[model samples]
Structures are given as C-alpha cells and as structure tokens.
Target: CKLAAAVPESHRKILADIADEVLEKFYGCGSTLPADGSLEGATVLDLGCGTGRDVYLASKLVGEHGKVIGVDMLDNQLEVARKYVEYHAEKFFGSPSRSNVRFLKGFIENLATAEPEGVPDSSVDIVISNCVCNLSTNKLALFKEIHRVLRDGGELYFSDVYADRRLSEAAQQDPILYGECLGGALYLEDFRRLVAEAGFRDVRLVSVGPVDVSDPQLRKLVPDVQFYSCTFRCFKVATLEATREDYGQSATYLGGIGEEFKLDRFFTFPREKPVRVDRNTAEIIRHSRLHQWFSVSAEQQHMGLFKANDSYALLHAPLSMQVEQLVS
Candidate 1:
C-alpha cells in the first residue's frame, strides 16, 4: 500500500529541525504539534511514531526535564529510530547527557499488550499520532487506551485520514488503500462517536484539508469516497459538555506564548487583555494546566448560547484578524 503525501507548508515547519533521514522515513499525513510549543516538562506519547521524526522534534521542546516515548509496531522502523537517538540528542540538546527520548516496539490498537511494560495509566500528559489510526482495525480500542493512559485534562492530539462516507467491506479489504490511509478510514460521524465512546466529551478541530488521490488506479478504486486530512485535539476533561454551552464565562491569555495562542485568527488575549469565552473553553483553561497562565471568571446564573461567530465583531475584532483565518 502506498502512503499519503503532500503536507502543507505550515505543517512542514514542524519537521524543519528534524534530520533528513527521519523526515524521509516519516509517513504522517498532517501536522500534529500540540496547541503551543509549551511542553517544557511534559511527558508526551507518540502513537505509530514511525522513524521518530515527531519524537525527536518534540524532544527538543520538552527539554531535559521532560520525556518523549515513541511507539511503533515495525521493528525495522523502531531500529531506525533508535539508531539516531544519540545523534539527534547531541544535535538538539548539545549534550548526550540530556537524552530524553525512548522508542518502544508496540501496536497502536493494543498499546498495553504490544509493549507489556507500557506507559502507566494516567501517566501521559499528551498523546499524539500521525496518520496511523486509520490503519487500526479497532479505532475504539485505540481511543479507549488513549483515554486510559491520559491523565485528567491530558489531550489526544492527532492527525489522520477520514472518509466522507463509510467504505464497503470490499473496499476495506484493499491492502493498498488501507496501507495508504484510505481504505480503513472511519466515516466522520463514526469517528465522532468513537472519540465520545473513549470518554472524550469535546473535540477541537485544529486544521483540515482535502486529500488528493493522484494515482489514477487508486483514485478509480474508490471514486465515491472523498478523503480528508484532519488534525484534532480531544481533552480528557470529564466536566466538558457534549455540546457547546454558555455560562457567561471568560478568560485572558497571558500572551507570553506569542501570537499562536489566538483562539481564532482574529481573537487572542494579549497579555492582561481579557477575552470572553464559552463555558467549555473557560473550563478547559481553568481545569487544565493553563489555569496558572490565565484568569477566568463566570457570571452568576447566566444563560445564552455562545455567539462564537459574532464574538470578535461584538468585542471589535483585532486589526490582524482583517487578514482572515486560513487553514493552511
């Protein structure tokens, strides 16, 4: 089976610091960088880590106080990842003494059994994957294990291929499409349910784009099913509402993280500048690790749907927002 390619320029930057060999061996379909590059002391897990491209990239962000665990089923791939561990560590940290990355031979579907001495329950601060979930036979099992391993408020941030429609049994049997991240894709609705079933109440779409099937033969095999490359982040916060709700809540981003923290292209809290937020986002900031960096407040018994589309206009959108938010 052939793998998907053609990553956008923005996501391409995530691999900018990665070594050439690691980048060449990567089979990811999209960028899966965490919300911001604030993983100073986090414990991150990368599912289907391939040749450890993302692992090495994250290792630099996490630094010596943090650790990154890369898991893959293919021994050869894991071997390649291990081979460059010392090399990448020396390159990024400037010292082999501060190595903070580990690679394990494991399957994404059965994370526990694949690596018996696997990551402990509630031990991971964040779990990320790149284009590997579609290849799993049981996505629910994969998600459930993600939730099981994530600590409360930890996130499952990943990118994968999804189909506009469910594939027929025969299409699912196609080794080429399956290996290329097409045949095993879950319908959009099915993917939503799978995430919910795995104990996630809310999902945030980070980015999305249509996948181009350039191969004439491969395109003909499933002409009716359109594929998409999507990046999503699902938090393990149990208090989140299934649907967006209003609680007259609000928050302020400290802005020390820079412009990337903007909740939207037009709306980000500059340091000490307050911004209104829906109850869910406010709760996410409060209940999770961001509370220290933000000050959130709620009104007494307030009720109203969060008018997200009009939020910027009502508060007067920022001049930078005039450029419009582009997915690329």
Candidate 2:
C-alpha cells in the first residue's frame, strides 16, 4: 500500500493515461524514475519493458526533444506496447512530428546484438530496468552490457531483488522462487562485486523495501531467506576510486528538486548549503547527469577516509527503519 506513495507526482499523473490493460499486466516491484526535470532531453532505454508501463512514463518525462527505446524478448508483450505508440504520442504531445519512443525485441544480456538495430557503444544516456535483471541467468553479462551501451558519465538506475545471504544451488531450480524473484536474487555483497566488475565502481542506494513471500504454501518451500527489493543508481565514470576517500569536497544544491536534495543514503543537501563529500561523491555530481542541479567544490586535500557504513550495515541498524523507505 505504501509503495504507491513512492512514485513522483508527475509520474502518477501520467500513469492515468496509460491503457488499463497494460497496467493490469505490470509485474514490477518498485516506483522507478529520477526527478522529472532531469529527464527533459535524455535518451533512456528500458530493459524488459513489459507492456510499456515505464516506457510511456519515460516518454512524457523526456519531453518533445527526448527519446526512449524499450526492449523485451516476448512478442506478446511487445505487441501491446507497439500498438499504443501513436495513441500515447497523440495524447501527450498532440502531434506526431515523429514518434519519440519505440519498442524492440532484445535479450537484456545481449543488447549489443539486439534485433532490428543493435545498440552501439556509448549511445544511451541512461538505462533503466524494472525487476527484470533477477530473471536473467547471466547477470555479469547483463551488467556488462549495460556498461557498454551507456555513454561514459551515463547512469544505470534500476530496481531489483536482493537476498540477505546467498542461496543454495537448489534454490535456482524452483518455479515458486522464480515467481517471487528469490531464485535469482543476488546477495547484496555479490551484487556489489558484479557491479564493480562491470565497470561501475561506486553505487548509490536510492530506496529499499521488504519483499514478503506471504503465500502460505510458498513459504514452506523457501523459508529462512530474507529478501529485499532495492533501487540503486550507478554512474559510468572511468576511474572511480575503490573507497570514499576524503578529498575535503563539498557540494551545494542549486535548487530544482524542492527543499532538500538527497543523492543517496548519506548525502543530503539543503538549498545553497554545503555538504561534505568524498572523492567518489565529488566526481559523481560533477561528471554525471546531475552536474547541473549541484555546484560542487573542487577537491582541496586528501584525508584518510570518510566515515561511512555499507548500505547493508545501515539497512539493519534500526529495528523500525521501515519508516525510512517512506521517501518523497
């Protein structure tokens, strides 16, 4: 019930226009979007875009000058998405000067050779996946594909399932586990390694929520594993350092997103107020798509470390942190 509260208001308004048939078929587990203003002229690619729910939302957010390409393997799903291209274009912009969003067939792991027109390296500004990565058998390949297609300084922002501890090989063979995304859920630690190996060094946790397996029968099959759905953002900067080494940097919000800007779990800035940053955080704002919303100070001197804990450590710190997920 609270998950509906997580969507940006602009998105909720546009959701009203999407075909009800498409909304009914949606299986996503989170509200996935950056602030609406940032998408004004972006090019976004939605992996496993079932029935174009997120595709249409991205379409309106990106405005007339921007474009979105949605890729999914199933023809049945793509059929519904493609059928409504003209309908949405007419509804949102009222003119078909050109279609801004298109649906194509592709496996998430191999966008390089995706059908019709394979995506070339460094072509996309952002790549968004909604609960689809867990279903893929080849996660490293899937992650690497995202890295290859995104332009340097582009972002990979998505939501997917994660487990408290790694599951056994036996867990992979069950259909019930697959249905709930627990079968392929990567332990958050292993997910961090895969993300690093795929060329995104520093990742941001945007929000997280619990995934309840309340199916009484299903509970018996998969007991004792704690599963969570987390939305994370990663930027493709070439040389991100291994740790948040203190560089005595700070950033000031220039004002776009209302009162305060929260970049992740730790970095929050009130308008015109400076927040201390490590080197990785410094480069992230200055180099990524977020450069415009913030004015970051240059690195002054090197300090040993920035006091920080891993997101996992922070996730379990409080017994009543379910309230933190109630983000604006």
Candidate 3:
C-alpha cells in the first residue's frame, strides 16, 4: 500500500500498464531481499523478479562497483522494470555515488541460455528473489538453472509461500489457488531434500512470517491449507575436491594436450584417488576425466614414468578422476 502510493506518477503509469497484464494477475507477500549485509563488490541476480522492486533496493546496496541483474519472463512485468531503468540509473549512477543494475526478460527455468550473455563463469556472488520461486512450474529446473549461472561460492536467497502439508489435488490444479503460491508452496523437508539433490551443501532459514487469508469463500474451499511466508538461503561451493598423491615435483599428463590438461596453478594431479603403482616401471595409470584421452599413450613424454613403461600398455584401467591437489 505505502509502496504503491510512494512511487511517482510516471512510475505509477508504468505500474498501471503492468497491472493490466500478468503481473496484475500475480500477487505476493514478504520481502525477498535479505537485510543480512551489504552487497558491495558482489554480482547479485534476482530470479523471477516481478516489478524490479528488489533490484532497486539491491542497486542501492551494491554501490558503484557491484552489479544487479533482474530477470522475469512476463513481458508486462519486464516493461514495468525497463521503464524505470533510466529513472533508477540516473538516480543511482548519475549522483555522486553510482550503482550498476540491469533487468533482463527471462523465465527462471530457462535462465542459462535465455538470460543475459555477459555474465562470465564464476562471476556472480549472490542471487535474491522475492516471492517468486514457488510460482514456477519447473522449480527443480529453476534451481538447477540457478546453480548453472552462479559462481562456485555464490548463494540464492529468496522469500516465498510454503505449506506445512501437501495441498489436495483439487487445490493444486486450481489457477486461483496456485497463483497465490498456496498449492504450489514446497513442503519444508521436501524443499531441503530438493536443494540437496540439486548439489547444494547448505540451506538455511532466514526468517518466517504467516500469511493471513481472510477471503471468506476461498478459505472455505481450502480450509486445511496454512501458508507461511519464508526466506531461505542456498549455496553451492567447491566442497568437492579432486585429490591425488605427491608425485615429487609433478605427475604424468596421461592425456596430455588433447584435454588441455594442465598441472599449473589451475590444476593438480592428485593421486589420492589412487593409480595402480607399477613398482618395476615407477609409472601409474590413473583413471580421470582430467586425463581422459591420455590413454592413447605412445609418443607423449609428459612424465618420467613414460620412460620406464608404455603409459597405455598397462591393461588394468585407473579407477576415477576425482583426484585434486589444491594449489598452494
């Protein structure tokens, strides 16, 4: 209510145009932008950003060096956000202190290919969303897409409706109920498991608030449903490490140049996963994606082991490539 009235007439005109379409059709409660900390020097993504409110708030917090990118699938909502691009840019960047923010039209489920092009691998540091994830039809794909776009340690923080118990099939199929994020709300434990399955090691609850649905008629239809507005943070880190043993100064590059396998700072030949050690030849054949094509042994001299025995002549295959030696 206060947010609507506070916006300028020009902004309201844009809002009115959005309200005429799908965004007007969508309603939500609670703040998805966490008040946790400053987003300075961080690249933040807003998934399913409706009307770009969180983007605007994040812009102020990220300051000049950091960036904010907001994405939404609906044209009407995108129009509302794009309308404020210049307005916010001038407000945030044109002043003594500046901010970097952009809004792209995209659905969360199809984020990897359809979203903006410039975000480099391992670039973004944080992503925030407000009451949007539950609205997605393919939320599993949405979470996977989130992981694909984020940097190694980046996190997703969002607020949305949730259910203590599963909604009836009738309620789930109803458009009116789904639009409210009720029938679509993820069950708490199921949500945790989903995040884990999607490769996140940590998921934490930030805050929880209740939804008050006093709508008399709708309440009668779905009396068993109780919704809690919640904010959660999920993150993907390089917790999984590739390990191998210390081969003195270096390890043999079995695949060599084909895989562009490097033993430099970017990679390490960890023998921790174990390569069958040849006591007679002082060579080891290790199974690894890192050394995948190296099995075609002859004519390559990347290691001292090649001198003692043919790298590929050993019949027993190496087991796994999950070996990594962290760079010192």
Q: How would the candidate models be sorted by TM-score, starting from the highest?
A: 2, 1, 3
Writing each residue's lDDT as its tens digit, candidate 2 over 1-328 gives 2233356666778999888877787655433777777787889999988789988888998988898988889888888888888888887889754569988788889997777788889988889987786789799999999999998778998888787677877777778788667888887778888889999887778777777777776666567877777788898987578676777788888988667777777677798988777778888888777888999898777877775334434433331243244232
lDDT of 1 by residue, 159-266 (tens): 787776778888788888887778888887778777898898776656566777878888777777767777777888878887555677778877555563654332
Question: Each model's TM-score?
Answer: 0.83, 0.89, 0.60
- Root-mean-square deviation of candidate 3: 15.9
Q: Highest TM-score, which number?
A: 2
Worst 10 residues of 1 by lDDT: 317-326
| Candidate 2 Cα misplacement greater than 4 A, ranges | 1-6, 24-31, 215-217, 308-328
Cα displacement (angstroms), candidate 3, residue 58, comes to 1.4
Candidate 3 weakest ten by summed lDDT: 319-328
- lDDT of predicted model 2: 0.78
lDDT of each: 0.72, 0.78, 0.54
